[PDB]
Symmetry: C6
């Protein structure tokens, strides 16, 4: 594998040095679009650009999308600070698109768990848009100590009943110090055009966070990139799992 | 930010010194209307008046509506005592209206949590009117000690199983010493006129207390000001939240 | 307020000394009607009579109906013993009627909790008639000690898991030593004649005990007097309350 | 009241000495009918006979039907042993009929709890016939000790988690040593002939044990004697009760 | 009663010595039919044969069917070993038929609990055929000790949370060492021919094990012999019971 | 029985030495087909081939399919390493087909528990395809120790609340180190052609793992081989069991 520390360096270097056919550093341009009047909160990164620049790294985001995306996001922060003199910008997402192989909902299985995959499909359902705690801060009601606990949208809420410093059992979730972002579920199934003869469309539930929330409604067909995540079924006692697609990138397709 | 102590002083000074086009101190007049035969229990404050008089403070009520409204209410109490020789008047509400930006139900999201927002919409549902304990007094059944515990209409009831003085586990809610006000839920969604082409109306549940209860019924379109509050969903184990609008001001709009 | 001890003295003196236009002590007469063949178990008291005789006390029953009615009932017991030579008569109810202001079901709110109110309305529902334990006696299955615990018809049953004398956890409810009276729920809402133009009738659930049970059925319009009581909603975790009218006096009205 | 010990003596003396118009000791005859080929398991006792012979005792069965019926049943056992030389006969029921006042289902209330009452009515429902443990024997799975615990058909099952001798928590219900009798529920309501003008028939659930099980079906109108018993409603937390009629005697009436 | 030890001796002697009209020992013949190519797993025993040979014992199987059937089955095992030189044969059932009195479903009651009864009726329902653990073997996951716990098809599963030897709480049900047989429920009610004039057919649920499973379907009228067993109703807190017929012998009847 | 150690040796020798009519070692060929471009993850083994080569072993897979299949799979791994110089190949399934006796769904019973059986039938239902943890790895959140716990698709998930090394109660399921395969339920019942005259089709639920998942849909008639497994019914307190067929081999049949 590729070191975390090192992976960032190669991502920084990719952003600032990759050029298209005419020599324009495209990622410089994109990183610039984070600074305008009505800015963007994320950088869409074309996998093919990355693969042509550093294919070893390109493969490591599909194999380890977690440390990969995190590395890229740190890198974006670096070039902002070093090259644009901007430190006080928020979380900026790294959103990879246009992956080598694009598979169908029916093709998704155990061999994808924790790996970035591209999926074509059609949106069947969309949730209402609720707040998610991306980072919860628990404050000790007694000694006043603060504890930072990042959360995961597909997992359950990780509380902490005991104070890490004084050890009192009087703790609460501090909504002001905590970090919320918009959250939205959606369902996506295989497109009935690519199927049948008497076949059954399979589906997959997925989640959308922050800036990519609300991009789609029922009927829209889409290409989405994401991580395939598993979580045990309701009862929490069967060795069988429920699969959710933590979306990293969406875009419509003109039918 | 602005100090609590200081924030009150600026609010007092705003109430007694702000004048309209002709020089009538309007808030003096309003504070006066608390003392008539069939009095009012609140002072509607026009944000624009405030902004023109002290814009730093005006912005601090939208950013910190909790300490802001509380400050204003204390100030009302001060001018009553100092300028009208009235101390025995009850809780008088500070109700801010006419905010700079007025957003739609569909626009409400994580970025509004704990911030005063203005919302235009249409009332879909209204609850029946129940008593709420705005302040509960728990009395020790054993040593007879009294404990004051203010409540929040959107949160759950905060009991106290242990006596703060003698430490006995025999305590009850004393309905006479406790403070009740009327409570009423309502639902408000985006107005179908400002939507569609095939779009879905989003909604938000909201709460009404004391003097503003029962001001509206299903069908009425309204402009409401309030705080966007979050509370975890039923199960209390998912890091996803339910959003409620603790209303600070309502008024109809003649359709 | 008025002392409990003293309040009784003034009620005794009201019963035996108040006379109508011709000088007949009406309450002497009423107290007498408790002693006939098919006696009554309560004395209806006309508020106006009381107000004209002792208005300070008359106001204290509307403000403190609990200690007020209780005081009056003790007084009845006194005149029975002192003036009729009767000690072995049961609980005799004090039932106040004809109060100064008579409000509607829609007018009932937080500002009435624990205060005697008069309400006009129409009966929508009536419960089946069940036994209520007005006074429960718990007996220790071990040391045989007896403990008296008066109950409230709108509250839940107050048990006692521990023996007050020997401290054994083997206790039961002794049905023979305990005191039961008939109990009956009913619903009353605003009369559709005093409403609408497109308005919604509000309702209130209420309870009837002992001699006043079974006085009314669905369709009958009535004027009832009673105490407005609150109790938390099902879950027992929301600071919102359910309101029940513990009836102190009912009478039909010929429509 | 009348002593238990003594009450038996007067019952024995009633059975063997009471004579009708011609001098036949009727209860001797009845007690004799317990000994034939297809015997009876109970003695029907005509209240009027008893009242004319010993009215003090006759009133004590209506006031204390529990110790009264029990006394009578012990007495039957005495005359069997002393006068018929029969000891090995089973439980023989004392079943009182023809009481002074016969009231209607709608008349039944809190003033009857634990008192023998006569009721006329019509059977609406009958249960299927299940076994009831009239006496449960619990055996210690460890030290083999036996404990006798009589049960009540309207109450719940009284277990015993702890051994009275060795104190082990390994105990079970021994079906062989335990005593079972047939049990059958039924519903009886006021007869529609004795009602209306727009009136609602009230009902009461009742239970039948052993030899009187299966005596009636839906449609049959009956006069039943029995004890009015109370037991708390489902939740077991409201001071309101459910009333059941533990039947002591039934007989049809030719409509 | 009759001793267990002794009871077996008389059963052995019955099997090998009872002869019909011509002197053929019929039970020798039957015991022989356990040894053929497609053998039987039970010996039907005609009660009348037994009664004529040893009526004291014949009555003890109707009074104590549990120790009686068990005794007979041990005896079959004895003659197999002693007279046929066969030890490795499985559990062979003793299935009694043709009892003196044959009663109807509606006649079955508390006076039959734990006694072999014959019943005529018609099959209304039959369960699907599931495996039952006739003998469960629990193995200690820690010290590897094995514990044998015979089960009852009408009772619940008797686990054992603690190891009888080392006392560890890590135990599981070992499916390989445990003994399973086929199980099948059925319902049988009184035949509508032997009823009515406006009468209601009563029913009884029953169970079938091992070789007698699947012998009947809905519509078939049958004569079954079995034990009447009781078990408490769902809640497990009312002293009322549910009755099930543990079938010991079935046979069709040509309608 | 046959030793585990030894059983493998005989299986290795069967794979590499068994030849058909022309002398081609068929299993060499099959093991070869695991190595191509789009390889297979299992070796279908024809029972008849095995029976003709080593019938003692052939019978031991039907009697002990668990240790049998496991032995065969180890053997496949041996020939791969020793004869193909391949060690890094995954789990490869041993899938036995064409057994001596092929029985019907209605014929399946307690006498098959834990034995490989062949079943003909028709597919009625098929589950959606979920991930199953074939091997769970639990990691200690405290001392970082790893524990391997193989799971069973028909059983429940076997957690481990205590750390095997440090003994901390802070443990979680590590999805990355854990092993997942696709899982799919299906229902199969007797074919209506081989039945009736007024007969009822019986059914059996079954499970498919890994490479054999998704091979069939409702309507397809099939011959499947598998293990008959039992597991207690929902409540987990009745000695009755639910039967599931852990499929070891499927194939369609052209109707
Ligand atoms: Zn702390
Ligand atoms: Zn205290
Ligand atoms: Zn005690
Ligand atoms: Zn014991
Ligand atoms: Zn052990
Ligand atoms: Zn550890």
């Amino acid at each position: 594998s590729v070191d975390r520390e090192e992976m960032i360096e190669r991502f920084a270097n990719f952003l600032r040095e990759y050029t298209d056919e005419d020599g324009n550093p495209v990622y410089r341009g994109k990183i610039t679009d984070l600074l305008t009047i009505t800015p963007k909160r994320s950088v869409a990164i074309d996998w093919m650009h990355l693969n042509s620049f550093d294919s070893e790294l390109a493969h490591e985001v599909i194999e380890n999308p977690e440390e990969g995306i995190s590395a890229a996001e740190d890198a974006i922060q670096i070039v902002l600070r070093e090259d644009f003199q901007r430190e006080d910008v928020g979380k900026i997402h790294a959103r990879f698109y246009n992956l080598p192989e694009t598979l169908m909902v029916k093709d998704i299985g155990a061999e994808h768990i924790n790996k970035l995959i591209q999926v074509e499909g059609i949106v069947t359902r969309v949730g209402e848009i609720k707040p998610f705690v991306s980072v919860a801060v628990f404050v000790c009601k007694d000694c006043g100590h603060e504890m930072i606990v990042p959360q995961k949208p597909y997992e359950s809420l990780e509380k902490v009943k005991k104070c890490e410093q004084c050890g009192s059992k009087n703790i609460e979730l501090d909504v002001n110090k905590s970090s919320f972002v918009n959250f939205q579920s959606f369902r996506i199934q295989d497109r009935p055009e690519t199927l049948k003869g008497g076949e059954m469309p399979r589906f997959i539930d997925g989640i959308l966070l922050d800036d990519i929330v609300d991009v789609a409604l029922p009927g829209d067909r889409v290409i989405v990139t994401g991580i395939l995540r598993v979580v045990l079924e309701k009862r929490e006692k069967t060795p069988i799992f429920r699969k959710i697609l933590e979306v990293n990138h969406i875009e419509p397709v003109s039918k």
